[PDB]
Amino acid sequence: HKSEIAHRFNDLGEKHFKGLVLVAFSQYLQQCPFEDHVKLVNEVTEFAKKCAADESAENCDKSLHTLFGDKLCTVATLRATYGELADCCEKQEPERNECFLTHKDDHPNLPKLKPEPDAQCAAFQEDPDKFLGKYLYEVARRHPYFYGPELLFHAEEYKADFTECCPADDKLACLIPKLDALKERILLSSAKERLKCSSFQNFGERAVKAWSVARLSQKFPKADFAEVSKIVTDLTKVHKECCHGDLLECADDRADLAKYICEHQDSISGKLKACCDKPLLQKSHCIAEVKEDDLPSDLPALAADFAEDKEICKHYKDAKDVFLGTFLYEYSRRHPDYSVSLLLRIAKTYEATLEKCCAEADPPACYRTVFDQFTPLVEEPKSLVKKNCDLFEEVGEYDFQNALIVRYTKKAPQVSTPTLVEIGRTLGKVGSRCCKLPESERLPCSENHLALALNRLCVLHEKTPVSEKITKCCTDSLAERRPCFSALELDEGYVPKEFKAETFTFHADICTLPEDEKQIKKQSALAELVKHKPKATKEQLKTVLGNFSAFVAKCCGREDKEACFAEEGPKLVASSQLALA
Ligand SMILES: [Br-]
Ligand SMILES: [Br-]
Ligand SMILES: [Br-]
Ligand SMILES: [Br-]
Ligand SMILES: [Br-]
Ligand SMILES: [Br-]
Ligand SMILES: [Br-]
Ligand SMILES: [Br-]
Ligand SMILES: [Br-]
Ligand SMILES: [Br-]
Ligand SMILES: [Br-]
C-alpha cells in the first residue's frame, strides 16, 4: 500500500470516510462552527480521491497521521480559538498528535442538546445533510474520545427516528421517547469508550487485553482460547487506534474484525446470526452489544488445572502471561455474573498466590487452597449492590443521587462541586437501570457502570488534581480502583471550607431552568453544605435540603417571585447553619 489514504478511502467508502473525518475533526477542534468543519472534511476527502486514482500524486504517500495533523495546523482560527493547541504544530510526529490529544477537553461545557420536535423536524426539512452532519458534529465535540464507527451508527438511528416520526400528526409523542433513549445510549457508550482510552493511557495495552479477555470470555463462553485471544488482539489494536485519533484505521480494522467474527460465528457464539445478516455499522454494533451466550454444559472444574496439577509452578515459570491468560479466560467464561473488575481482582490474587506459593518449599500444599481466597472477594461486591439497590428502591432516584452526592463529598471534599454532583447523579441513574435486573445481571450492571463513573471522576480530577487520596486511587491499579474508592472516608484532618452565604443564596432565575438544571443547582448546594459541615449526618443534610427545596418551590410559585426569594432566602441560609451542627 503506497498510499494509506487511498487505501482507507477505497475500503471505507466516501460517506463513512467523510463521516469519520467530520467526527475526528469535531473531537480535536471542539468549538469550531459546523461550517468550517464541513470544508475541511471536503478538502481531505478531495485529496483522498486524487490519491485513490493516482498514488504517485504529490503527498499521497504520507501517513494519515501526518496528513490529518498538517490539516489541523492549517485551520485559520486555530491560534485564536484554540490557543496553546497551536504550539503543538511546532512539534513533529508522533509528539504532535500526543500533544493534540492532551488538549482534547473532557469537560467542554457546551449547551445541553435537547429534543425540540417542531424545531428539529423543520431543520430536518430545511436541510437534511447539514442535519445528520450536525448531529455527528455535536455528539463528537461533546465527547472527544467517542468511538468513531459507533457514532456514525447512532447517526443512522437518529435519521431513522426523524424520518419515521416527523410525518405523523403527533411528532413529539413518537419522537421524544426515541430521542431520550438515544441520549442515554450515547452517554453510556461514551463513558465505555473513555475507560478504554484511559486504560491505554494510564495502565497500558496489557491491562486493556486482560479486561477484554475477561469480558469477551464472558460474552463468548463457547469460544476456545485461541479465538478469544485473536479477537482480543484485534480489538485492542482497533481501540488503540481510535483512542489515538486514527479513526480511519480504527474503522477499517473494525470492519475486518466484524468480518472475521461473522465468518467464524459457529466457533464463537450462537447469538451472532442476526447480527451477521446486517449492513456494516449495524453489524458491528450488534456484535458489540451481543447478549452473553449460554454457559456450555461440558466444562470441567478449574481446580484440576489451576489448583491440583503439580507442574503448575513449572507452567507459570515458562509462560507466565499465557498461563495466567488461560486462568482468566477459563474463570471468566464460568462466571457471566461477575463484574469485569471482580474477575481481574480474582486473577491478580491468583498471580499473587503463585509467586508467594512457588517460593515456599512445598507449593502444591499452599496453592491447593488458592480458591478459598476468591470467596471474600466475590462477597464484597454483592454487599455493596444490595446495600445500594435497597436504599434506591426505598427513596427513589433523586434521593439516591443525593445520598451518593453526600457520600462522595465526604470521601473527597476537595474535589470540585460540578464533578461531585455529576458522579452522584450518574450513580443514581445506575440504580434505576440496574436494580430491577435479575441478580445474575444486577451485580455486573452496577459495578460495570460504577467503573465507568469512577473513571469519569478520575479523568476530571486529573485535569486539575486537588486530592492525593484520589490520585492514589485513580493511578494505582485498575482492578483495585473500586475497593480503593470504597475505602475512602472523611479524613480527621479535613478543614471545613469556610461558610459563604452567597453559595447558599437563591434567586428567581432558577424558576425558568429545566427541572434537571433545577436539581443540579440544588444538588450543588447540597455538596457545599457537606464541604462546610462535613461531620453533619446524612439525615440532617436531607432535612436542610428539603427546606431549600420547599423554599425554592414556593417562591417559584409566588406572584412576585423576586420579592419571595429576597425575603425568604436569608432565613434559610441562617437556620441551615444551625441545623447542621
Ligand atoms: Br489532506
Ligand atoms: Br468522550
Ligand atoms: Br487514521
Ligand atoms: Br464497523
Ligand atoms: Br469456524
Ligand atoms: Br479530598
Ligand atoms: Br459515567
Ligand atoms: Br474535580
Ligand atoms: Br461505596
Ligand atoms: Br430574586
Ligand atoms: Br434549614
Curated annotation (Swiss-Prot):
Top-level taxonomic group: Eukaryota
Principal place of residence: secreted
Record's protein name: Albumin
Cystines in this chain: 51-60, 73-89, 88-99, 121-166, 165-174, 197-243, 242-250, 262-276, 275-286, 313-358, 357-366, 389-435, 434-445, 458-474, 473-484, 511-556, 555-564
PROSITE patterns according to UniProt: ALBUMIN_1, ALBUMIN_2
Residues annotated for Zn(2+) binding in this entry: 65, 244, 246
Residues binding Ca(2+) 1, per UniProt: 4, 241, 246, 249
Record localization: Secreted
Similarity comment: Belongs to the ALB/AFP/VDB family.
PANTHER family the record matches: ALBUMIN, SERUM ALBUMIN-RELATED
Residues noted as binding Ca(2+) 2 in the record, renumbered to the chain: 11, 252, 256
Organism of derivation: Equus caballus (Horse)
Binding residue positions for Cu cation: 1
Function: Binds water, Ca(2+), Na(+), K(+), fatty acids, hormones, bilirubin and drugs. Its main function is the regulation of the colloidal osmotic pressure of blood. Major zinc transporter in plasma, typically binds about 80% of all plasma zinc. Major calcium and magnesium transporter in plasma, binds approximately 45% of circulating calcium and magnesium in plasma. Potentially has more than two calcium-binding sites and might additionally bind calcium in a non-specific manner.
Residues found modified as Phosphoserine: 3, 56, 63, 416, 486
